[PDB]
Amino acid sequence: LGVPRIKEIINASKVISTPIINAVLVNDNDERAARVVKGRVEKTLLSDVAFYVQDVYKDNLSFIQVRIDLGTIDKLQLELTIEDIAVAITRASKLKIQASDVNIIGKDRIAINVFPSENDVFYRMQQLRRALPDVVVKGLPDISRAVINIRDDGKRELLVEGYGLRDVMCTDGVIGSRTTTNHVLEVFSVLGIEAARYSIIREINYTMSNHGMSVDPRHIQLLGDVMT
């Protein structure tokens, strides 16, 4: 929030340290009003909802099992029971090695079949039981974390730490009209050049008003104009 922030803005860095998306909501409550949206925007949840990942072998069949718990999904108000986890696992597993036939055995236990110059089955099983917990079953695959905040008042908003603004505007329970990131290059790709120059002006003003500097806003407007 100082000279480094101004340096990043003027360099127009496509990646910045600490991006924040200030997504206001449509409802005012914690229980099942803010936390529902917060669940809609989160980093990784399979490790959060598995409560263990198994490695089952038999005479001839190798099953990667994960007995999901409903307690986490109900306490942390998420919206996914089995099949959402399954489809997320498919793309993730296909991305790393592959995903041919994922199965569900019921009772919240999704079972992944693994089948075939030797020991490839064991190597794939090892890397699978490693890389399986760290997959995204809910939320956005770019958000660092999500925090629900208070602007020294009574309404509650979530400031998220991700790199997706279109997705957060499109998520339900968030006003897409009033949702502002710190990221000028993210505003430009999503909202356009005029909103981007608004963002440049506003962020430089914010950086110069937290320090008690007094710079006439016409200088900042000229800087944004010359940039855009």
Partner 1 sequence: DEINTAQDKWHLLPAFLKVKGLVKQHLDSFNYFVDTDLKKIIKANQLILSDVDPEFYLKYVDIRVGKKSSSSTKDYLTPPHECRLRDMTYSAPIYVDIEYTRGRNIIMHKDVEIGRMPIMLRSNKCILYDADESKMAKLNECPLDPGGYFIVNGTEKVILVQEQLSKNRIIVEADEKKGIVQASVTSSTHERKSKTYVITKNGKIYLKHNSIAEEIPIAIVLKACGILSDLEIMQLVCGNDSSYQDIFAVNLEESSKLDIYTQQQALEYIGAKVKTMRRQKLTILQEGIEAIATTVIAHLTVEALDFREKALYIAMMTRRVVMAMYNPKMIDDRDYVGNKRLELAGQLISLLFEDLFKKFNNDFKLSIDKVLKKPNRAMEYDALLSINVHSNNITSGLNRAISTGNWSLKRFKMERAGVTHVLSRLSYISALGMMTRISSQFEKSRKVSGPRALQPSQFGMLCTADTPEGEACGLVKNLALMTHITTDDEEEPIKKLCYVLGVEDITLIDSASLHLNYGVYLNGTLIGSIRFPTKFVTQFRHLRRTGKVSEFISIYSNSHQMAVHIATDGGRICRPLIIVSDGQSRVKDIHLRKLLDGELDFDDFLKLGLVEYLDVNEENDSYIALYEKDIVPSMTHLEIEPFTILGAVAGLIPYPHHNQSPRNTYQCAMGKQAIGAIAYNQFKRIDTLLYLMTYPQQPMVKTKTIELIDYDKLPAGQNATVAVMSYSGYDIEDALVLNKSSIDRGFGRCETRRKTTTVLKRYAN
Partner 2 sequence: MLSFCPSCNNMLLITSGDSGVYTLACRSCPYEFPIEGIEIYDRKKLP
Residue 121's binding partner, choosing from partner 2, partner 1, none, with beta-carbon cut-off 5 to 8 A by kind?
partner 2
- Closest C-alpha to 116, from 97, 129, 92: 97
If the CB atoms of residues 51 and 206 are measured against partner 2, the closer one turns out to be 51
Indicate whether 97 belongs to the interface with partner 2 (CB under 8 A): no
If the CB atoms of residues 54 and 126 are measured against partner 1, the closer one turns out to be 126
State the Cα–Cα distance between residues 112 and 155, nearest whole angstrom. Answer: 44
Stretch that binds partner 2, among 3-11, 28-36, 113-121, 142-150 (CB under 8 A): 113-121
| Dihedral sign (CA 91, 97, 99, 104) | negative
Stretch that binds partner 2, among 23-31, 120-128, 174-182, 207-215 (CB under 8 A): 120-128
Indicate whether 177 belongs to the interface with partner 2 (CB under 8 A): no
Indicate whether 145 belongs to the interface with partner 2 (CB under 8 A): no
- β partners of residue 21: 160, 181
Residue 130's binding partner, choosing from partner 1, partner 2, none, with beta-carbon cut-off 5 to 8 A by kind?
partner 1
Rounded (5°) CA angle 163-164-169: 145
State the Cα–Cα distance between residues 145 and 20, nearest whole angstrom. Answer: 10
Assess contact for 187 and 165: CB atoms under 8 A. yes
Residue 59's binding partner, choosing from partner 2, partner 1, none, with beta-carbon cut-off 5 to 8 A by kind?
partner 2
Indicate whether 154 belongs to the interface with partner 2 (CB under 8 A): no
Taking the complex as a whole, the smallest distance from the CB of residue 24 to partner 1 amounts, in Å, to: 30
What is the rounded radius of gyration, in angstroms, for the C-alpha atoms of the chain? 22
Indicate whether 107 belongs to the interface with partner 2 (CB under 8 A): no
Indicate whether 216 belongs to the interface with partner 2 (CB under 8 A): no
- Find all residues with CB under 8 Å of 149, minimum gap 6, and list them: 156, 157, 158, 159
Out of 3, 17, 32, 58, point to the residue binding partner 2 (CB under 8 A): 58
State the Cα–Cα distance between residues 50 and 48, nearest whole angstrom. Answer: 6
Indicate whether 133 belongs to the interface with partner 2 (CB under 8 A): yes
DSSP codes of every residue in 190-223: HT-HHHHHHHHHHHHHHHHHTTT----HHHHHHH
- Look up residue 184 and give its two tokens: 């000028």
- Where along the sequence are the contacts to partner 2 (CB under 8 A)? 47-48, 50-62, 65, 116, 118-119, 121-122, 125, 133
